Amino acid sequence: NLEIVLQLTALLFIVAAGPLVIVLLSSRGGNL
Amino acid sequence: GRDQESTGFAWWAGNARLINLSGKLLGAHVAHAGLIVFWAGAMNLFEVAHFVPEKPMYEQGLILLPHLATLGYGVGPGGEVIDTYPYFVSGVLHLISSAVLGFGGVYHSLVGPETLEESFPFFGYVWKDKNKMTTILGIHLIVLGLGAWLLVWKAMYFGGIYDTWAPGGGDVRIITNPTVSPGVIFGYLFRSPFGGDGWIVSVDNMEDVIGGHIWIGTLCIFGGIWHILTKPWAWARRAFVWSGEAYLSYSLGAISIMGFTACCMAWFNTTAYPSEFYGPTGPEASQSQTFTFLVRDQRLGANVASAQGPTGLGKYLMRSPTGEIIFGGETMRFWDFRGPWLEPLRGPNGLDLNKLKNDIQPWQERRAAEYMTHAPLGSLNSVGGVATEINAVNYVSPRSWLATSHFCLGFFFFVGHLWHAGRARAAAAGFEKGIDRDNEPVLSMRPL
Amino acid sequence: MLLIFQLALFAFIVVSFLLVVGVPVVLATPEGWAENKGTVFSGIGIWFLLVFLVGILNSFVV
Amino acid sequence: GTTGRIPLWLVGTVAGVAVIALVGIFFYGSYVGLGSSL
Amino acid sequence: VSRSGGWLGSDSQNINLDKWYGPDRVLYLPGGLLARDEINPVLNGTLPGDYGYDPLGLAKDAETLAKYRANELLHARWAMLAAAGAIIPEGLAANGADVKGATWFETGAAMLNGGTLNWFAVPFVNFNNPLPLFAVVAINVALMAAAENYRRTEDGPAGYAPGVGKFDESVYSNMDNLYPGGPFDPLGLADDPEVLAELKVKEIKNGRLAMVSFLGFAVQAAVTGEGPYANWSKHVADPFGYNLLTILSSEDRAAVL
Amino acid sequence: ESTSLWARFCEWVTSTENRLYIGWFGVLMIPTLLTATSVFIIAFIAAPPVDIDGIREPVSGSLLYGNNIITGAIIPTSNAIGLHFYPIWEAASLDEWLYNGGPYQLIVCHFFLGVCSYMGREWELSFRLGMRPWIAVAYSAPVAAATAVFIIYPLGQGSFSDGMPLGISGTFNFMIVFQAEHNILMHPFHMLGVAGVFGGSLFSAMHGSLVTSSLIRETTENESANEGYKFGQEEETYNIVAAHGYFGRLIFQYASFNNSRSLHFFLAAWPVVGIWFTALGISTMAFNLNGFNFNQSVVDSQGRVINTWADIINRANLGMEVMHERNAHNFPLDLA
Amino acid sequence: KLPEAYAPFDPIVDVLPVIPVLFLLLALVWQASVSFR
Amino acid sequence: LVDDRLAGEGTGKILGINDPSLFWAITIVFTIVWGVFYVSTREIDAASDRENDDDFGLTL
Amino acid sequence: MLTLKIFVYTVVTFFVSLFIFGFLSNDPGRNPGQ
Ligand code: CLA
Ligand code: CLA
Ligand SMILES: CC1=C(/C=C/C(C)=C/C=C/C(C)=C/C=C/C=C(C)/C=C/C=C(C)/C=C/C2=C(C)CCCC2(C)C)C(C)(C)CCC1
Ligand SMILES: CC1=C(/C=C/C(C)=C/C=C/C(C)=C/C=C/C=C(C)/C=C/C=C(C)/C=C/C2=C(C)CCCC2(C)C)C(C)(C)CCC1
Ligand SMILES: CC1=C(/C=C/C(C)=C\C=C\C(C)=C\C=C/C=C(C)\C=C\C=C(C)\C=C\C2=C(C)CCCC2(C)C)C(C)(C)CCC1
Ligand SMILES: [Cl-]
Ligand SMILES: [Cl-]
């Protein structure tokens, strides 16, 4: 099950990379 | 960005705020281009990773690898995949290229110039400038022509293109004599779209395929130079709406036609879409069933030519309404199907009876047997077979996915023409927001 | 070279993730494209160097 | 006490992700275990 | 009346020196990446091909820039002659011409052991050049040493050039160290000041292209061991099959499948 | 003012003073629809039986040949024809054209051009009257459905004989065979189509009942309430706030459209989007991408298959499959 | 499959193709952050 | 054979032109319609009140 | 049947030509707004 664990881990980053950008801009008062 | 307070467009029509922001509109189009290249790269690597050599391409749900195979990458004689490394570098090259394409999209969208008309007159444009619009049309017309010449260069100088009709079996072949005769080219273009004719979907040689792309490459280059050195004439100026949304609707109508044509190409054509990679077509599978039962019943002992069905028509062999000897049954409708495994048994008058009972090669039987079981029939959840079948086989033909999807895209982009072209005329005329309460046109008309 | 190649590919993935989040953040930030523009170019340059490094190392490992 | 409010868009985003995750699990379970034909 | 004119009909001469000279001169990075105030101040847009490109701060004053530009223009002009002269003879031999020592990095060995070279006046008859190696070394060194000393001392002997007819030592005076003109401009293409400024830009830009190209010719010779024409002909013949990556592989890559 | 023949002709064609607007799409719509109408009426009354399956077994579809209004139909073209173009001039005799199902192709081909031109004619009048141009977009939904069952489904299946017969009982045969071969009921797009028409029927009833419930008193009880409205009124004939108040209490305040413009867009979008997907559903099933197949999906611990309601549907689908086109199949698989 | 050198990175490839559909949702969450201005 | 027919079905003829007379039918009709249209363009444009210069046509 | 084919080709070309040159006759200018 190491394969699916790695797939979910990689999936966790990418589904968070997007919102990570928005929250950083929202917190830092960015031009978003 | 902007808001509805200063633009009048809500968030759900937000990209309409870019109509006159040429700089940001550039980044929008470059960013979507990065997405297209990203998907091509990501889906290519996804298919390469999930590729098992013990099955054919069409049994693994691959739609991009067949496109690479038809270009003659990593395929040996007979449609056998020998090496998937060329498929790998195709995915990597697109994936990396999407990054720089994505950066330019993000740069030209978020922090680049909003309008290019001031700082960069070469790239700046206003939709009303018909001359400038034609130059952009002319320029991008040349790169399309050059892209077409890449295909013929691949087919004539760089390895070649996979020919499913090649003598000695389907293989990668160098095209040395492309068919550039005007009669052949015009014959395909102005052919009927009905049965037997099939418009351009009936191109059945790689000589005609890359012969046509020579014409397309040349026409687009000359058309590019033409539309660069000339501005639209008076007849055109009084026939088209010269607005940014109007130009979009013209393209939407165009690629709607292209979407429908790709749907029919993937469904019927066996030259540009070899059955070795995309699987059998609808007509091919039905034609393969009667061929399979003709072969197996001969061994059991039966005169297939003299065998009658319940209806009195030939059980195995009958005549088309034009006289050609064809396979019997319901597949009488598919009598205009032509395939690499079936043409050797076909003479000038149709299927040759002597060759059908004396010279059926084992490879022809194996091809027809394989094509019958992989008929383009399946369910939404990818259950192979007719709707009245058990959950045993996990298979839907790539032709089914390609034809079904690009018809839905073709139809919706036709609604794009209807929507974006209707609005283009109304906005230019100036009543896209509603009827003037004090100046209603109908109120000034004679009653019916 | 297999371990060297995989380390370079992993480094390429990590720096790509930094650019995927870092670049839009500094671009949207008003001061970002004026001050952090220097460190963005370093990230782009390193990213391209790893592309070519992984590219040549692919020849000796595949 | 602690002054503050959770942003509404953040509530919608997290709830939206949870719903998408729940649907994905249902589609995952469609291919495994009971009801998978396997 | 003018000795200069356009190439595409009347009013087809449009020499824009603004793009290559002055504040709005093009730069090695676009507008959105590099601000014009970040350029080294010594690069003020008065020299041909001033793309404002000097990292490492090598040019720190006008004198240093002038000294290096004397080096750049000479390295550029020699590379232009070399780039053309390193690949043209090899292209002849590959197409069937009788050229001994086609590849540039093997011409020297051909003159060893008393062997000679064939000079091809390409449009016309070829030549079985009799000059032996000892003679070639002597004549080439003598002519080159004399020519370079005249450039170094900025003075030479009286002689004949078609543009100026017969000239004396006086013409060598008042000649630019880098753009002598005069006898060196027999066709008189430097008469128009606007044309001369534009053509100066084309000289270094073709020159800088040649310098990087010859660098590739050398690096490529070390790696692939073939002449530059052979590398080009086989990249064009099979691009994906013959490139840097394929050579570095140096093995029959097993099919992945 | 105009003196040129074409200038006067183009003014008449685009004239909004005609009782029925013609326009440029009408010079295509009128001849095609009249051609299809003429042959349809003549064929529905007096056409000879048609050999639809290509097995030399003609099927009677005309009133003068023993059918009533329900069972009468224009039989599709013969299976021997397939997708081949079969105009009347490609037949040796008009008797042969009738026998092979010629009239069906003539109707379908001219009718498809008629509805496409009818759609454009709807845009053209809106432009001539200075109104917003998206009634034609809403009309694209029924056009897509008509195009799917007359053109695209025959195209994918390989024969015009698989198109919908132009008749009432012929339509039912089309649906039943369609279920047996594609399991259309289990397809998510007929599901969206059903929600489109059930929802559209619900929304039509609700909007009609809510507006009727809110009519402002302007008449007596011995007169129709309709008399309270005068054609050309500048004021509203019903109280929108009152109707919103009723429906607000009926479920909850924010489940109701306070905006008439948003409400009417919703009334248009819901059925149009639903019919778009069910039209796509038939189009996708034309290329044999059938609906969900959950047969033998539930098996017990030891492997025994436990039937579900989907398996009972398969039993009904099995019965239709083995009975449609009884004499047409010589081989076990229905690949055509 | 991928080349043996790229085998450890296979799980990343298995999630890459779904990224483009995330951009549509990313635009939606971006508009929600700015209150659909 | 027993009967006569055009026998042009499924033969891939350009515009379906089995005989050259069909070419004259299409060409003559198109030329006539084009002929009456061509001699009326100026009158139609005159109604616009603008001259069909490089700035003529519906433009937003 | 050729006579029928030529008649139909004449008729179809006639109505299509009117459609084509109809929209080329400054169609966009035929609107009630200004
Ligand atoms: C292919 C899809 C696509 C693309 C390319 C664009 C592009 C654009 N949109 Mg748009 N939009 C889209 C879809 C898209 N949109 C959809 C589906 C909707 C409906 C919800 C909208 C609704 C919408 C509205 C309402 C508006 C826009 C606006 C804009 C423009 C400016 C946005 C901005 O500056 O705000 C800033 C955005 C951010 C700061 C957050 C995004 C940060 C980055 C870009 C995220 C991507 C990170 C990426 C992975 C990094 C890798 C790149 C590289 C390092 C490899 C821009 C050109 C605005 C406009 O019109 O300009 C006037 C605006 O008003 N859009
Ligand atoms: C259709 C795509 C397109 C178009 C029309 C433009 C247009 C423009 N760009 Mg832009 N850009 C793009 C894509 C595009 N760009 C991409 C993909 C990137 C990421 C690398 C950038 C990054 C970029 C930057 C950083 C800047 C511009 C700038 C500019 C403006 C002028 C200066 C310039 O040319 O700079 C860019 C010059 C280059 C990028 C040199 C590239 C070398 C050649 C042209 C590459 C061609 C390779 C080949 C044809 C590509 C094959 C096709 C591919 C899709 C497979 C100009 C209006 C400048 C600006 O906005 O001023 C404020 C600026 O600073 N661009
Ligand atoms: C290639 C690759 C890469 C890259 C990646 C990327 C590019 C990523 C991106 C990604 C993205 C781009 C992401 C994003 C996503 C999004 C999201 C996750 C969101 C969602 C949302 C939701 C779910 C919700 C919504 C809503 C709102 C809030 C409003 C209202 C309504 C609703 C609720 C619906 C990496 C680095 C890995 C490395 C390796 C390779
Ligand atoms: C403007 C804007 C928008 C959009 C944007 C976009 C669309 C972007 C794109 C972007 C992009 C388009 C990006 C891309 C990226 C990519 C990358 C970054 C790559 C990576 C790669 C890597 C990292 C590596 C990989 C590998 C190889 C090499 C081999 C195999 C293995 C592997 C896979 C590992 C939005 C909507 C938000 C809205 C707002 C505005
Ligand atoms: C590559 C290739 C080929 C082909 C080629 C070609 C040559 C194509 C072309 C095509 C062309 C060359 C053309 C087409 C099309 C066009 C179209 C489809 C359109 C038209 C449109 C429109 C839109 C019109 C309109 C109108 C006018 C007149 C103006 C205004 C008014 C109206 C709107 C009415 C072949 C087959 C061999 C196969 C293989 C590949
Ligand atoms: Cl039946
Ligand atoms: Cl059958």
From Swiss-Prot, chain G:
The chain crosses the membrane at residues 12-32. One of the components of the core complex of photosystem II (PSII). PSII is a light-driven water:plastoquinone oxidoreductase that uses light energy to abstract electrons from H(2)O, generating O(2) and a proton gradient subsequently used for ATP formation. It consists of a core antenna complex that captures photons, and an electron transfer chain that converts photonic excitation into a charge separation. SUPFAM superfamilies: Photosystem II reaction center protein K, PsbK (SSF161037). It is found in: Plastid, Chloroplast thylakoid membrane. PSII is composed of 1 copy each of membrane proteins PsbA, PsbB, PsbC, PsbD, PsbE, PsbF, PsbH, PsbI, PsbJ, PsbK, PsbL, PsbM, PsbT, PsbX, PsbY, PsbZ, Psb30/Ycf12, at least 3 peripheral proteins of the oxygen-evolving complex and a large number of cofactors. It forms dimeric complexes. One of its GO terms (biological process) is photosynthesis. It holds the Pfam family PsbK. GO terms for cellular component: chloroplast thylakoid membrane; photosystem II reaction center. InterPro entries: PSII_PsbK, PSII_PsbK_sf. Belongs to the PsbK family. It is a single-pass membrane protein. Keywords: Chloroplast, Membrane, Photosynthesis, Photosystem II, Plastid, Reaction center, Thylakoid, Transmembrane, Transmembrane helix. This is Photosystem II reaction center protein K.
